[PDB]
Symmetry: C2
Subunit: 64 residues, 2 copies
């Protein structure tokens, strides 16, 4: 419920900071694409966290 | 000492490469060049991104302004 709504708040907040750093640092990248990419990663944060921390092959766990 | 900096830079690349691949497969309309660029950037700041994703989004504040 409310407990689940703040789940998303977390995810959304990260996505938003992310969209910024990317806009700032990838020349030519549109805002929309930056948003889409950030939401995708933020939505998948624990897998990315594990990838960034120790090893890339934790990206395996991404489902598609 | 420097072999470790060699191993780390390699791991940077291997990460940037897998990131590029997951991004072009998952963000429709994202170009290869842009996925590449953003992947290298994150990979070069992997410790700040790991902290961002692990808990506080706010650690991305520690990324300096673009050169």
């Amino acid at each position: 419920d409310r407990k689940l709504a703040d789940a998303h708040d977390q995810m959304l907040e990260l996505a938003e900071l992310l969209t910024d750093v990317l806009i700032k640092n990838v020349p030519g990248l549109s805002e929309k694409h930056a948003e889409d990419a950030s939401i995708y990663m933020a939505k998948n944060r624990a897998v990315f966290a594990a990838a960034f921390k120790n090893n890339a092959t934790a990206l395996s766990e991404l489902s598609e």
